[PDB]
Design a protein around this nucleic acid. Structure first.
Lengths: 168, 77, 167, 260, 69
RNA sequence: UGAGUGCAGGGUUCUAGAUCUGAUACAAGUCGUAACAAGGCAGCUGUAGGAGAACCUGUAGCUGGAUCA
RNA sequence: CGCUAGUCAAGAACGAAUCCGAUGAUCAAGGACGUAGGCUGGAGGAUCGAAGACGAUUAGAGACCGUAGUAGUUCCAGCAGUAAACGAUGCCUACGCUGUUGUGGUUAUGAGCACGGCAGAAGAGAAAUCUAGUAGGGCUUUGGGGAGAGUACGCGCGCAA
RNA sequence: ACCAGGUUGAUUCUGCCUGACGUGGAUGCUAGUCUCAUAGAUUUAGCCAUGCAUGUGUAAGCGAAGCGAUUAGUGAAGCGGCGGAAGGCUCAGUAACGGGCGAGUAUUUAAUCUCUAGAACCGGACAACCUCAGGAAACAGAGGGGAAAACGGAGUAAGAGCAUGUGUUAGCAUGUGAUGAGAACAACAGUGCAGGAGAGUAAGAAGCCAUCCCAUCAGUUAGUAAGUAGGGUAAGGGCCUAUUUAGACGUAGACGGGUACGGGGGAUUAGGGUUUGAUUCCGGAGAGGGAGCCUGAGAGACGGCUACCAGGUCCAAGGACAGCAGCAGGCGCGAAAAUUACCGAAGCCUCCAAGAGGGCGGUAGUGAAGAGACGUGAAAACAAGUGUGUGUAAAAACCACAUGAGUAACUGGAGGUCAAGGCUGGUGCCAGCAUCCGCGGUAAUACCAGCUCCAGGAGUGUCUAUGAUGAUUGCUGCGAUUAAAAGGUCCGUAGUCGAAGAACAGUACUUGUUUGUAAUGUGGCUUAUCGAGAGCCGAAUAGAACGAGAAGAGUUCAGAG
């Protein structure tokens, strides 16, 4: 049926391709994700930014290039993903940095997720018990609880994250 | 009288054109009676309906051209 | 009833067309009014938007204008002499626009006699008026406007129409 | 359809009204009146949105049953009455006065004014006719009619109206160097000064304009109202004086020009 | 029922023929080729049985459910 | 202005029918053996006769022939 | 399309300082020709020989082989419209390596122009081989896994086939 | 912007079958929590029990009975006024004014706006009221009063058309004239109604351009094509009729037949494409099938009327009534689709209204059609429960605090394609399995089971259409010596295609400016714990208006051949 809402995953063309199976298995294992759908969701997000960079570099006009480059780079800096010293009002560096985006990887999006941040900031003994503190309300940000492990943490929120003891 | 108008239509898939035409029946007045004939080109203006098929009237014409009935030199030169 | 739509009409290429609607009132027609000569009888018809139209069934008289001398008079109508569309409307004496009619000439005779040049300007009209012949043409639409009005035939108009009457 | 239309679906209503798509299926169908339906707004949208003074239909009723609201000097009692451009709105209690104008985006907006500006409006001249008893008349864009005005006023000029007497006060014509306001098109709500006019036959005249901060833009005469005797404007315009910026310009102005 | 033709259908499972009586109602299904075509080694048969008396034949054969009776 | 209904015809789509005649599948039934080797008369294309049946015979052609001579 | 003379029209190629000036390429519909075998009428009838009849050979031969024998095989006036009608390679127009051998004209005797054969090469192609090399030049015909099927129904031509 | 298995004793090719992946319906087995969408379209535009979906009154049109009164009052039966022509449902018919873009006439328009703008007398009835009183019911009679801003007449303003001057063209002058009206009331301090001229809204008719398959459908048409004159209409016009002229349309596909609600848009997609559109927006048509119609500003109306045909319902047998392609609901038909639920609240529409009405619309209930975010433990310490408050029209859910606690996985597979066992027991070409290739004749990693593994996971298998796979439909981009495939040879029309040199012109061609897109989609930003979601911004297709450039295309010339 045709109805509201987008679809956020793309199914792989070959269901039993051995190099894909092994490399996916590793990354789910290491990062403590629920199933293959969590991973595929991040992959589509990553692809979208790569497409924008491609389009910008090949555009003929200057007005669009100067306008939309800035927006793309600023956004990815705020998420804490693309960390480099982009200088504005300088055409060459904008081109240089756009080229550096083109080999961005899903690992970089994964490491901004709250489940990984909690463990990485040494507030939990494993990526597993980090998830188990996001459930059951033990994790709090700016004085308010966050129930969802997929919460992507912007650059500089790290000062305000906290854990509290269990209710028992 | 019957006037033909001609034009080209672009077919997107094959990236090429086809020739087309349409027939329009127009009113000719007695003031033009001897002057306009087959092959000539004519300018017509729009009006309210005159009959089942007729909506334009001939308002003037451009006569199918002759540059010159070419010169013949005198035999004396 | 009667319709003015082109539902039933063929295409210009000679082919038939299919019907895609039942009839609509906004293209209704009405039966002809056949105005006869006689004592006045006129009917009032309620028309679109609540307007009124006046339909003459029988008429006795008309206003008739003289164009050269610039006066108008009111006179009885005798009979139709000629009708351009159909020979039948003449023999049954039906009134329409462009019908040519015989009328009482005496009022016109009394007025035109005042001009000392009258005989010299139009001898054929003068002769007709002596012989008791007086002819006019109707300009109004009796079935629409509810009355008949016209002008007296003079000069070359007489010369033209009199040739249509003669056997 | 067997007869005249009564309803108006929310997705079909003018983009100038700026109403939220998701809340309900209908919108108010303006009553017949001064301006066209495409160039005006019903009064109940003004009181609930543009200038918030009611929040429910019961309150909208009450305000007008008590006879509070005055438009062009007359008290109004139809909630669906249309108001248009250059159209003084007022509440005599608390002595408030407003004109109706466009945002730079082309939406409608109310602008607060003093009791001086509240005395006049501007319209455009559409036709001239002589009427039974040999009486000259003139007519304007918003269905206005005027008896024994100055005969020299020409079709296409713009006229200033005194709201209390309902007479014409001043007249201005379409010439080089005068101030113009933009009613419809790509550049709604812009304000500028005439560079040059190119005359066309049997078709609209093309007018070329310079903006106050340098930008040229041209449009057809049918979208322009002339809003001053020569140099400078009659009516007071918005907090921002009708300058429109591209997203490109907004970026340059925010982060600085691209250096060599 | 829908055409008043009489057709041949195949009965899939191990003991499947025992789950059907004469004058039972059955629902019938396609074999999965592009046109209606024979599949495997069965000559000239073009459909297979799916349900008997409103219940799944797979459940009947494997004794997970019983006849409506 | 016309609904309905008489009587003849047409145009479409389905369906019945004594009997005849095609095709396809026939584990392997009966009679021969026409083709593939110079397959035991080299094969094949057109046309015309004939014949249980493959096919056979006259006439013109072709090599994809058993001969690049 | 193959004996010799005489006669009657038109065409191809070659030589060259003749004339006219875009008159041209390809082609549904429409029209003319088309080996052999066949058909309608006339002439004729040597040789060969479908059909038909015998003699042998074989389990059986109705066939192959031998004896005999008719329609046809020839000519004039027509109908018909198919072939392994094949170099199984559409028609105009290009760009393209060498050696050798023909046919007809012309020649500074060095060569050319039109129509061919042959042998390598380089490219090409699944190979065999090359009318198949290079290529978004123009226009028409035409194929889309085997079978059923070039068959059924309708239609057009033909005396019939 | 991608491949794999399958003709042979092996090989290299042509070629088709099958797998692997989106999406629309149907269905098996299994199912913890919360949020956003959507549901008798496909078959029968088949048939329908019941209840509801359209009515409205003020200080201010007329006011009967009743009640009551020192000649007051009341409170309203009917009449009048305004609406019932919108919205809701469906896709039968239509190859067309059905669809896109421009333009504003040859037209009519209750309400509403601006300017302007009204000295008028007389008479009956109809309904309700009162007295009889019919009929099985549905529905009606006699007789007698009496009102209006209801209705008909009188005068009177006004006044269509016709003719001539003058200003196209209003206007004015003059002659002639059919027709022929009109509302006030209340003071809580206002509300109405007559005439004009211009607007505003809505239709009717028109201009240009685009539109499906069959040639085993090649000729079609005679109001057909046109002219003159008249009738008719709100209005142009063969729209209709009389006499004259023979036209109009076709191989660039006429005419006939089959099929179809049309767009904005949807699905797939590197690009070029291929498929669909009953279905939130716009426009069209219908109300069992056909046809006629009154009233009105507006209907050829069906929750109006009238007749036939097909079907029904009640009767006292004489007659009456009725039409769910509105909302619930029932029966059928099918492989196929929810509650005879609440609603002085949100968005809007209707009236004579500080109020009344609305199944239009909103709120929940039901269902693994679709789309988000999360449970099923951690190494010290875990959903779903419950109670208060909130929330709403009232609710439930959601959220806040406080109490208990310790519950929570299945579907398809394991010989190759294709991830994962020659494990143990039965069966012996049986029973079965297998999209394809193939397994089983007593030593079956392939059947039937046990046990371990694999894949996705609140989900997974199957069937059926379609897009991709596919350069197996080829514009980009395939083939025709032998694999399927160049007409036996010429002539030839329509069609498609056509030198050099010197000049010329602007309609195609390309481009500027201006128009032309609500939703959806595209580039962004901001707020619901997060993410779909919601809100605001910017640019945009095809199509049209006006300019510009002249290479290619086009037209002409001859001291060129």
């Amino acid at each position: 049926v045709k109805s509201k809402g987008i679809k956020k995953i793309v199914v792989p063309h070959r269901p039993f391709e051995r190099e894909r199976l092994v490399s996916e298995m590793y990354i789910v294992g290491k990062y403590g994700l629920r199933n293959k759908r969590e991973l595929w969701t991040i992959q589509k997000m990553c692809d979208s930014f790569k497409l924008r960079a491609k389009d910008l570099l090949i555009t003929p006009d200057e007005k669009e290039f100067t306008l939309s480059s800035r927006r793309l780079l600023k956004k990815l800096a705020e998420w804490g993903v693309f960390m480099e010293d982009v200088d504005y009002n300088n055409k060459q560096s904008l081109t240089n940095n756009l080229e550096k985006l083109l080999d961005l990887a899903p690992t970089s999006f994964l490491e901004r997720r709250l489940q990984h941040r909690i463990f990485d900031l040494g507030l939990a003994s494993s990526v597993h018990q980090a998830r188990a503190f996001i459930h059951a309300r033990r994790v709090k940000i700016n004085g308010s609880v966050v129930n969802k492990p997929g919460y992507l943490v912007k650059d500089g929120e790290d000062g305000f994250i906290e854990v509290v003891e269990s209710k028992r | 009288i019957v006037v033909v108008k001609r034009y080209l239509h672009y077919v997107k898939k094959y990236k090429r054109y086809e020739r087309r035409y349409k027939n329009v029946s127009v009113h000719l007045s007695p003031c033009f009676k001897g002057l306009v004939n087959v092959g000539d080109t004519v300018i017509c203006g729009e009006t309210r309906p005159l009959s089942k098929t007729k909506r334009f009237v001939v308002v003037g014409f451009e006569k199918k051209e002759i540059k010159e009935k070419k010169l013949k030199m005198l035999s004396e030169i | 009833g009667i319709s003015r739509s082109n539902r039933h009409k063929r295409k210009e290429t000679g082919g038939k067309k299919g019907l895609h609607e039942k009839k609509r009132k906004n293209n209704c027609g009405r039966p002809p009014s056949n105005t006869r000569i006689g004592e006045r009888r006129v009917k009032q018809v309620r028309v679109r938007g609540g307007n009124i139209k006046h339909r003459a069934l029988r008429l006795d008289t008309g206003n008739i204008a003289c164009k050269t001398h610039n006066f108008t008079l009111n006179t009885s109508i005798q009979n139709v002499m000629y009708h351009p569309s159909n020979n039948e409307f003449m023999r049954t004496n039906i009134l329409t626009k462009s019908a040519v009619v015989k009328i009482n000439g005496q009022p016109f005779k009394h007025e035109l006699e005042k001009d000392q040049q009258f005989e010299s300007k139009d001898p054929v009209l003068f002769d007709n008026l002596r012989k008791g012949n007086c002819y006019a043409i109707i300009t109004s639409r009796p079935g629409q406007v509810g009355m008949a009005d016209g002008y007296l035939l003079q000069g070359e108009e007489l010369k033209f129409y009199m040739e249509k009457f003669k056997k | 359809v067997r007869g005249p239309r009564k309803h108006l679906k929310r997705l079909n209503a003018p983009k100038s009204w700026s109403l939220d798509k998701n809340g309900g299926v209908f919108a108010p169908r303006t009553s017949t009146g001064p301006h066209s339906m495409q160039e005006s707004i019903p009064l109940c949208l003004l009181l609930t949105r543009i200038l918030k003074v009611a929040s429910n239909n019961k309150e909208i009723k009450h305000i007008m049953k008590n006879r509070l609201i005055t438009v062009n000097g007359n008290i109004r009692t139809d909630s669906r009455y249309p108001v248009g451009i250059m159209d003084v709105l007022s509440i005599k209690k608390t002595n408030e006065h407003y004109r109706l104008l466009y945002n730079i985006a082309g939406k409608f907006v109310l602008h607060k004014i003093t009791e001086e500006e509240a005395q006049y409006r501007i319209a455009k001249v559409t036709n001239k006719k002589v009427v039974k008893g040999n009486i000259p008349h003139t007519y304007t864009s918003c269905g206005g009619s005027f008896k024994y005005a100055d005969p020299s006023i020409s079709i296409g000029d713009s006229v200033k109206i005194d709201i209390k007497t309902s007479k014409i006060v001043e007249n201005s014509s379409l010439e080089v160097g005068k101030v113009v306001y933009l009613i419809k098109g790509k550049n709604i709500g812009c304000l500028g000064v005439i560079t040059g006019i190119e005359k066309r036959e049997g078709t609209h005249d093309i007018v070329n304009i310079v903006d106050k901060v340098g930008r040229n833009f041209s449009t057809i005469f049918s979208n322009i109202l002339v809003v001053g005797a020569d140099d400078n404007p009659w009516v007071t315009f918005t907090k921002d004086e009708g300058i429109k910026y591209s997203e490109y310009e907004q970026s340059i102005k925010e982060y600085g020009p691209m250096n060599e | 029922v829908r055409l008043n033709k009489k057709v041949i259908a195949y009965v899939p499972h191990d003991g499947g023929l025992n789950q059907i009586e004469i004058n039972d109602e059955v629902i019938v299904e396609g074999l999965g080729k592009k046109g209606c075509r024979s599949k495997g080694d069965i000559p000239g048969v073009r459909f297979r049985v799916c349900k008997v008396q409103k219940v799944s034949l797979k459940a009947l054969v494997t004794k997970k459910k019983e006849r409506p009776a």
